Design a protein around this nucleic acid. Structure first.
Lengths: 281, 281
DNA sequence: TTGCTGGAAAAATAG
DNA sequence: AACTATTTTTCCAGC
């Protein structure tokens, strides 16, 4: 690498060459801390591969550089995150160099693979605020950012001593720890008359801000009658919640109907379903 | 202040002068982080005044120094706590100087008030691990102390260039957050047969490690039949808990008996009582 | 017995 | 000021 300042303005394509991101990285990747183990490379959005960058308009071996930059605007290396290498008996080999104090990961883009590479060797390291705080004061109430972009860039050298610098940043990635699926561990009531209205205490975990309690007949994705039970907000809690039993659709059943309850969180659905029996009026 | 090393050995009285603590500080004062907006001074044991120090055997204006030191032994400034000034339209004015890296608060002791002062301008700041690292060493920041003493000391200058240094440390003060009073906000069952055994979901707050759920008949301190309800440990939580209804003492009541439920925490008792009705078999 | 994560408690900050 | 709610960091525990 020629080491052109990381802060300079550079184009994605030029002189008949483009550095494009074929496969964007996941929208979220939990950064790891120095005090703990490694946490893995950054995957793609299907979690089944890795962000993939391609270099069209050129067919020679060229080192690809990667580093973690701010989440938006003019590309600057992020101030709270540092890129890091991820070793593995299947991961692409790479070097870990330091530029202007920020860590940059050098991988090798090659024509033997049509100038394409699935970056599977880059992880994100979280720097401690307090630590950053006492170096760059401008970073704190001025800005504590938890989002970052994977910054890719190639430094080709033209015929003379010149060097063309193509750079392309990915979509932002939220670098914190994911919500975790909702779960119901135990409910206080398992049976109620068809008119409902009786309260049910639910204790479990991960009841996020956008959670909903759903009373359903079966597991008919398309429709087997479902209904949002009203939640008590004056006592909402990530681990417990009080909901009122929604009245059943058939006020005139002759026999007890067994239905299921499960919760939806802005992040997912409590895959384990609770049984609840509606009984005639 | 002459700035004599904070670690030196100094007497309380000497040369016909004593620096005595008339009113010891509270046995507990919740330290606050520097980011914390709240700044209370350290009160006395009646919570109605402040620790008061007096300088007998001298009648001139002399600056009184205060700083937070270890909880016992040879006075050394505490490594996890720093003294801090507390401003107020009624609090005594003072300066905040730094000595050997520790913060010292300078107040003015004066004869116009018979060499006495009720230090109402000193608070205690809790140092965050990362701060304690840069101050007292990494391995040191592991040996945790949550107790500290308010260290008072005067630096009088004798006729010549000499300086007499009287120092007196207070009783230790606990600087951790004072556990809270338990509370029951809502229960799922309010009535049960005399034999009991039915579970009751309790959601409230501050259900500490040593909490007990008590079913009682009245508010007869001495005795009006009380009983610890069994708690489910596999789901214990500071804000909620599942207990089984203890069977009543009179398996043969003819009429429904109304009893109360309240919780005891290693720190106190949920003063607000919940009603529960036992019903005949 | 150490390394990779998912889960969380504890530490610090926000509102 | 005194609380309550969120975030950040540091710990744990299960392969």
């Amino acid at each position: 690498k020629k080491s052109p300042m990381l802060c300079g303005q550079y184009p994605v394509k030029s002189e008949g060459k483009e550095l494009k991101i074929v496969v964007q990285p996941e929208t979220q990747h939990r950064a790891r801390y120095l005090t703990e183990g490694s946490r893995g490379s950054v995957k793609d959005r299907t979690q089944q591969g890795f962000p993939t960058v391609k270099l069209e308009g050129h067919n020679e071996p060229v080192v690809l550089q990667v580093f973690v930059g701010n989440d938006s605007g003019r590309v600057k290396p992020h101030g709270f995150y540092q890129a890091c290498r991820v070793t593995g008996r299947n991961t692409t080999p790479c070097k870990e160099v330091d530029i202007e104090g920020t860590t940059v990961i050098e991988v090798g883009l090659d024509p033997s693979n049509n100038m394409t590479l699935a970056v599977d060797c880059v992880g994100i390291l979280k720097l401690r605020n307090a630590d950053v705080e006492a170096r760059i004061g401008i970073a704190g109430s001025k800005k504590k950012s938890t989002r970052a972009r994977l910054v890719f860039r190639v430094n080709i050298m033209r015929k003379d001593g010149s060097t063309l610098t193509l750079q392309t940043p990915s979509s932002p990635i939220l670098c914190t720890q994911p919500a975790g699926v909702p779960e119901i561990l135990k409910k206080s009531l398992h049976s109620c008359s068809v008119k409902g209205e009786e309260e049910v205490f639910l204790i479990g975990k991960n009841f996020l801000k956008g959670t909903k309690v759903i009373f359903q007949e079966n597991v008919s994705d398309e429709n087997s009658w479902k209904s949002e039970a009203e939640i008590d907000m004056e006592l909402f809690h990530q681990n417990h919640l009080i909901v009122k039993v929604p009245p059943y659709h058939d006020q005139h059943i002759t026999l007890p109907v067994s239905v299921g309850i499960y919760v939806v969180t802005n992040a997912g659905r409590s895959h384990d379903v609770q049984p609840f029996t509606y009984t005639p009026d």
